[PDB]
What we know:
The structure is a monomer. By secondary structure, the chain is an alpha+beta fold. The protein contains 9 helices and 11 strands. Strand 1 and strand 2 form a beta hairpin. It binds ligand R6V. The ligand N#CC[C@H](C1CCCC1)n1cc(-c2nc(Nc3ccc(C4CCNCC4)cc3)nc3[nH]ccc23)cn1 binds next to strand 1, strand 2, strand 3 and strand 5. Ligand R6V binds next to strand 1, strand 2, strand 3 and strand 5. This is Tyrosine-protein kinase JAK2. One of its GO terms (biological process) is signal transduction. It is found in: Endomembrane system; Cytoplasm; Nucleus.
Amino acid sequence: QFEERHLKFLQQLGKGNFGSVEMCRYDPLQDNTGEVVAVKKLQHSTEEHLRDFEREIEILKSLQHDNIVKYKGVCYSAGRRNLKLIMEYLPYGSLRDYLQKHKERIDHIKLLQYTSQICKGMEYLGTKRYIHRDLATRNILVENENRVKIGDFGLTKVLPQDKEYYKVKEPGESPIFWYAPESLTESKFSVASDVWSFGVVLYELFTYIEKSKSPPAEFMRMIGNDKQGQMIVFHLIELLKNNGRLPRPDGCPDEIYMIMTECWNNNVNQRPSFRDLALRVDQIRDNMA
Ligand SMILES: N#CC[C@H](C1CCCC1)n1cc(-c2nc(Nc3ccc(C4CCNCC4)cc3)nc3[nH]ccc23)cn1
């Protein structure tokens, strides 16, 4: 739908792994009236990254929800090379950076508003049988002070029709400090591993992204910080099997930490559902108000 000749590059907004998002102005009339959009592209347009990207685009296009970034279209050149995904531009950027920047202005009730919106977005994913696999505040975007959206689906997979998990280990770096144990040991991803990662997201939020308190920093201090490469993963696994966990963040109430710890259950089937997480968060919100 979008012609590349009319996409005006403005700046880079974010970089992932093998991909990036740019702020552009779509201005077909060439009079500086076009709307600003976010444009995702591959940084290395190989076959498997390209088919993965096409599947990611199809996934995003099939999602329509208040807390999921809006698909707008695609843009390609030259036959079909340099495929680009056009999305709505959300003016406050990632929740990670936004929270770190406005920590003094954002109270617990607002954190729980965001938490509730993330849970509702994730529940919608689950109704489509999609596994996000990369839930983290760096992949949540801020539309305004009252609304966040899941903002990236580059690792999202669809469950087999006959199974409740998806096994995949692809080369590169993996956000292992957000991974459920069964994802570390067996590469198994499920709604329940998304729930584990959501618990880490809740931890992130209540740390206010204070950067000695990041999951990587805390876990590395727990496993020993002389650890080596692959050994890290091994030690992390051992840590989680002995019920080592991220600590309660400064100022975090006990009941919120308990939501976290319930999401961090070694037993995959004992983790709460996203609907129950939303109910509990919303009840605490109501109590606070
Ligand atoms: N998620 C997610 C992560 C993803 C990575 C890129 C590819 C995979 C991982 N990534 C998506 C966006 C993104 N950013 C915006 N806006 C935005 C962003 C930054 C600012 C800063 C605010 C103030 N300081 C100066 C600039 C302002 C606005 N809008 C978007 N729409 C769709 C995506 C998207 C950014 N990183």
